Design a protein around this ligand. Structure first.
Ligand SMILES: [Zn+2]
Ligand SMILES: [Zn+2]
Ligand SMILES: [Zn+2]
Ligand SMILES: [Zn+2]
Lengths: 199, 565, 198, 274, 199, 159
RNA sequence: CAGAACGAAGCGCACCUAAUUUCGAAUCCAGCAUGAGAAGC
């Protein structure tokens, strides 16, 4: 429209964070150093997928509130188009008004990424039945993203900040049931014009 | 066309750029130690090469690959698997040395990691078809994983030899494997047995009470001095004391199938080589008095873990310092070897261990080619040795282009079948034929069935069957021993070569002594320990028998289970 | 007469995806990947660039109140009396700016990596779908040239504003998910048209 | 070289720093190798590359083993089927290549192999296409590809019930209502010259083909929601655009009922070429 | 004259190339599958019209240099006869000395011609509003031509080579504003004798 | 001369009856057999095995096929992309087309899912798998017919 | 003929999934201009 809503999100990990590497070339090269490599950019910065955690958080909570939201996590689902998670995060004919950017670390993989030993202990002989290594973003790193809503509606900062508390309680990334991914978002918002670059 | 980028002294960089019209193929991207900015400008001159090939894992041939990854001039890095695993020690050690010597680092650790991101591996005698060429690797008897690259291009067949080994290598095969076809251009590298005497003088020193410090290179040399101290029935312990060399010793044992035929198919060094892991245990030996053999590795005595042992050996008179390899200039090893410094310990030298071949072995290498090569580009070595070997190669009636200075070979494709009766269907002058493609030297002939009627008229791995292999892969796929990740990885290693597949299944099936765990996937269902081991051995034998079968047959057997690999 | 020659250099600050348009390349790749990148036959990566600049200036100039048409709605005829129809084109009178395809400075095997993407069920937190797609790495350099034939004054300014808009929103596809965030650098010059004549 | 008899070379010397030497032999040096047409014997102290040697025994091997820089290939000539073969076997034993004497042939097939009777060979049944400059050797999947091409073009050439007298129940509105509607739908850009031309083209191929064309331009796709009419030029609302598209459908369908002369005389006042 | 300049041009596409079909039967028997066919020979190669690109290049360039070149691009323009473009490419009275061939490809339309899918994307829905298909010639495809000047003047290679840089920076045919038709030219000139077949 | 081609799919152009053909004129002993693309594939396999040697579909009626295809195109199990890929693999051969439909219909033992597009509309799991099995049976029964009839069936659902 | 640095030990591996879907249209243009003679037999 004649405005856009910019939400500048700032994540500070409070527990170790893991999001797995998605690149076949980067997974297969780090198969003899770590068995669980983290997701990293080619500029050595850690890349977490944000759009998908916000959508799932809002879909879970809005289903539990009694609203008309659909589920896009069931296999090969068709976004209906008349949800508020179908206007924000997109349908199959209309794109998402909210452009959610990846959470990219302010530091590099040599200051936040550490390689760790995880174990599987036998419940009778109390001994290390399995040993494996993984990478994990430390407890205190800082990630930054930016959500650009293209047609600002009223319930868009109130709906993103409601999915953010759900991600602060549940977690972002992987291994979330064993304690990984506990984060704390800080949000600064602003309403910009669409013609701020035209001079 | 071949370019020789720094092929005179190998310092300031080294490279062999074969420029096919569809492909810039690079071989031996290396540096010889003795500068950085000339190395950069040499890499800039190189241009975008589709592939850098590395014969061995010395920095002489593989020391400049991460710099080409930095400048993004290289797109694939093909080497042997042992060369990959050894270069993942050499490159990290080079960067460690570069930072610790406070000389602007030639590349970074990121560059090394990206180099192994674009690193494909293929073994010996496995032809890869890339960019209108055919690249086959052949063992050359140097350090482990070293090969003699055979690029077959339409302009000709080029055999880059690299460093050919000598007869005194006890862990590789002596006769260096060669292309069985027509080599047109031989890029040979010129050169630069009192082994048992080692035993004698070590038996001299231990019985006299002292120890023996044995300088060694970490790539190949320590692991052969260790084999010589292993087969000889000695009485005193031998102790390897080098983090990089103990790692390389473990890599030699891991890559056993890529070694001599006697040693492949029990510790290779027959244990008795008690390994010093922590540096506290190295200071213990430095302060010790038990007469023992120290096969350590600082190299040519310059920097490393010898440098602590060296002072204690130096002050002692009843010990010795057996130098083994070539001591170089501006290096401690020469100065203690030439007597610049006063040693109290005996300074012996055994010229037997020399990973580089001599003149006669290179002559035998040129002679055992099926067709005498049109040209022998001698490249590296001293100038004087190159003049001598060039004169003797001329005496054997072979052309020599020494690297200070042209028949148009063109493999043609003759048709040899009738082309009069053609038809047009979809605006294509087409004709159906049923015939035979024959691959002759300098000539690929398509030849009709009549040719085959005359041609015909004139004329270790276990062995299961197709049915038993199919049945056992099905059973071990339904109790979840053979998964789809396992079948895909087995297919990848089998594409990398049959000995790579043998190494993969041996690495999975190996029960670790301490834990008692094999890396197969445990069997789903009710089975006892003896039954579980009898299923794991079935997995071992069923997948080992598959390695004997041909590539397409393995693909057809392993596409009903993992339908993507 | 003169001509403007805006050389643009683009460094990807995020993973980038532009889908392959060629059907044969898409079919050949779609036995391995589920989402191939738009790749040249010289193994370089080709992003479309005219539509992004035109859409950027259309969305921007519609917010400043300036009379710009829409060439993005279905089968819309361009007007011919707008700045976007001058710099990018109309039905009669071609666009003065020849915008080149953003060709990478590096090859497919150095900047393009296969990636694994998922679809996680919202109540069992388990992967329901998996799809492999190719993506351009962070750091890849793409060079294009913009050749304005009859140069006016505001053409460079509006092209730079469109480049800032693409710097915010993105180039290519999957833009809602964080893909395509890129940085643009501009070096413009006013060359003579008769500069090839000796 | 061309082994016509009498040989040839490329100048077309029929047998360039040439020099003669007693054959008790011509040494044709070229930049592409220094040839040596030995002739008959019953030698240059320099670089030989190709030795065209006439075989007609041990004396030939002696001759070969006195040339500095042993030759790359030795074309054997002037002998019978057995003589040039036995000399060839002896020369292969001395590690020297023998050779016993247009459009490029580009093979586009696989590389599986065998080691059959010391003749590395592979069985291939395929096709040989002859492009102007080349004769490609390609496999049967290429033939399947061009077969799918010709089938998926040949089935798009007779649409059936075309140019044929048959049959309807088409609507009705007067010649003056058809004229008025086509005028309005030509001013707003819904009915265009290309649309009217293609409607006439599919009308000549029967009434049924024109009905299929018009129901193909009026089909609102259930996924996108876009009829294939050209959108109107103006400021109409969505319901009005729907009504204009419906008027276009009804007008063209009603014009299908009228005879061909009337359809022509209505539709050359809006598009002169058909 | 006694001499004839023969310029042998070799062109390599650096971008996708589209030059659309002119033959109405072939266009109407290929717009059943692809909405934008490329112009092809009946020997299944690809034609590109070259003369008019050379004339347009030298006309735009030499009207900017300040020479007396006429415009033959405006509708039903009479070529004057007294400029260099009229000497080289033709007037109404005289014919042009430069006999420009077409740019016929070296390869056929199954190794060079691919079918692409282009879109039209709505600006407030960020989704496709139109889809069309197009035929195009791949990058690195080689086309060949031969300009043949019959009465060779001196500035007749330096004009045809100065136009060939203009058809490197602008484009040769088709959608040149989207990015298509970016090529590279390589010239191997030769001045043969006219009687070179008589001898 | 002998026609080994089914003379069906005969249209009506002008006052003539036509069928668009693409085939092989084999000649042997003045029989001059106008065969099809299916004889030649067999004869090609005969020569391919000769060179390389010396070194039950369910019958559903046409109306049932059309009805099931119409329902499965409206619940969005048979999509246009699915019909196009089935046409490509039918062009590659009957065995490849059975292999493709078996690949799509295969319930993976680990995930419990099949490569069909899910039914649009509210159903139960048993109804959904019944519709999947109907898709399997209808397309497998389509493999039984000839190329021209499969083309005429599928062109009214994906042009 | 090249890399080389207050204790122990073990271990650092598996598995699944890598599909599905929409659209593939629309519009403009189709002109002009010159020349119709000159010889021979
Ligand atoms: Zn929805
Ligand atoms: Zn070496
Ligand atoms: Zn406009
Ligand atoms: Zn003029």
């Amino acid at each position: 429209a004649k405005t856009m809503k910019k939400i500048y999100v700032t994540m500070k990990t409070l527990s170790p964070l893991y999001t797995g590497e998605v690149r076949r070339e980067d997974k297969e090269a780090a198969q003899k150093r770590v068995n669980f490599p983290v997701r990293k950019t080619a500029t050595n910065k850690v890349l977490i997928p944000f759009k998908g955690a916000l959508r799932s958080a809002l879909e879970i909570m809005l289903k539990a509130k009694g609203e008309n939201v659909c589920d896009t996590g069931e296999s090969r689902a068709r976004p209906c188009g008349r949800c508020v998670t179908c206007s924000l995060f997109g349908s199959m004919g209309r794109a998402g008004r909210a452009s959610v950017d990846f959470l990219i670390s302010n530091d590099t993989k040599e200051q936040i990424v550490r390689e760790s030993t995880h174990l599987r202990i036998e419940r009778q002989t109390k001994s290390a039945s399995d040993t494996f290594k993984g990478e994990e973003v430390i407890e205190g790193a800082t990630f930054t993203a930016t959500i650009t809503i293209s047609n600002p509606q009223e319930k868009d900062l109130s709906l993103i900040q409601s999915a953010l508390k759900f991600i602060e309680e549940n977690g972002i990334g992987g291994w979330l049931n064993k304690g990984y991914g506990r984060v704390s978002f800080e949000v600064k918002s602003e309403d910009v014009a669409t013609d701020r670059f035209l001079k | 066309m071949i370019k020789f980028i720094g092929g005179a002294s190998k310092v300031t960089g080294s490279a062999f750029l074969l420029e096919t019209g569809n492909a810039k193929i690079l071989i031996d991207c290396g540096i010889e130690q003795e500068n950085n900015e000339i190395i950069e400008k040499k890499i800039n001159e190189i241009g975008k090469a589709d592939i850098c090939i590395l014969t061995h894992a010395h920095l002489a041939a593989s020391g400049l690959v991460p710099l080409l990854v930095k400048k993004r001039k290289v797109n694939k890095i093909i080497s042997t698997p042992a060369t990959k695993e050894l270069c993942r020690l050499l490159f990290n050690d080079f960067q460690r040395i570069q930072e610790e010597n406070n000389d602007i680092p030639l590349y970074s650790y990121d560059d090394i990691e990206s180099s192994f991101e674009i690193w494909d591996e293929i073994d010996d005698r496995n032809t890869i078809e890339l960019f209108d060429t055919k690249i086959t690797f052949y063992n050359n008897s140097h350090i482990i994983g070293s090969v003699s690259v055979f690029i077959e291009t339409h302009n000709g067949n080029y055999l880059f030899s690299g460093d050919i080994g000598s007869k005194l290598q006890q862990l590789m095969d002596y006769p260096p494997d060669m292309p069985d076809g027509n080599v047109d251009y031989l890029i040979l590298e010129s050169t630069y047995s009192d082994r048992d005497r080692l035993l004698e003088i070590a038996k001299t020193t231990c019985e006299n009470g002292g120890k023996v410090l044995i300088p060694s290179f970490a790539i190949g040399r320590l692991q052969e001095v260790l084999y010589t101290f292993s087969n000889y029935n000695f009485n005193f312990p031998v102790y390897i004391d080098s983090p990089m060399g103990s790692k390389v010793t473990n890599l030699i044992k891991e890559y056993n199938i890529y070694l001599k035929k006697k040693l492949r198919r029990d510790d290779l060094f027959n244990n008795k080589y008690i390994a010093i892991n922590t540096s506290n245990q190295s200071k213990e030996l430095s302060n010790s008095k038990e007469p023992a053999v120290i096969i350590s590795a600082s190299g040519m005595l310059e920097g490393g873990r010898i440098l602590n042992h060296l002072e204690q050996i130096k002050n002692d008179e009843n010990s010795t310092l057996i130098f083994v390899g070539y001591q170089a200039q501006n290096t401690r090893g020469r100065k203690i070897l030439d007597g610049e410094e006063k040693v109290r310990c005996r300074i012996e030298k055994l010229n037997s261990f020399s990973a580089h071949a001599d003149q006669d072995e290179l002559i035998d290498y040129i002679e055992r080619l099926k067709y005498t090569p049109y040209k022998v580009f001698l490249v590296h070595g001293e100038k004087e040795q190159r003049e001598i070997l060039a004169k003797r190669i001329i005496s054997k009636k072979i052309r020599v282009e020494l690297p200070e200075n042209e028949i148009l070979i063109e493999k043609k494709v003759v048709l040899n079948i009738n082309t009069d009766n053609m038809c047009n269907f979809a605006s294509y002058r087409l004709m159906p034929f049923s015939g035979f493609i024959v691959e002759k030297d300098d000539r690929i002939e398509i030849n009709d069935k009549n040719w085959f009627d005359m041609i015909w008229n004139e004329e270790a791995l276990p062995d299961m069957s197709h049915d038993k292999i199919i049945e056992n892969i099905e059973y071990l796929f339904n109790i979840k021993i053979l998964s789809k990740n396992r079948i895909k990885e087995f297919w990848e290693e089998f594409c990398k070569g049959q000995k790579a597949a043998i190494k993969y299944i041996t690495q999975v099936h190996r029960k670790n002594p301490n834990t008692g765990r094999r890396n197969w996937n445990p069997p789903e269902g009710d089975f006892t320990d003896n039954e579980i081991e009898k299923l794991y051995e079935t997995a071992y034998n069923t997948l080992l028998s598959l390695i004997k079968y041909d590539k397409n047959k393995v693909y057809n057997i392993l596409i009903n289970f993992n339908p993507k690999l």
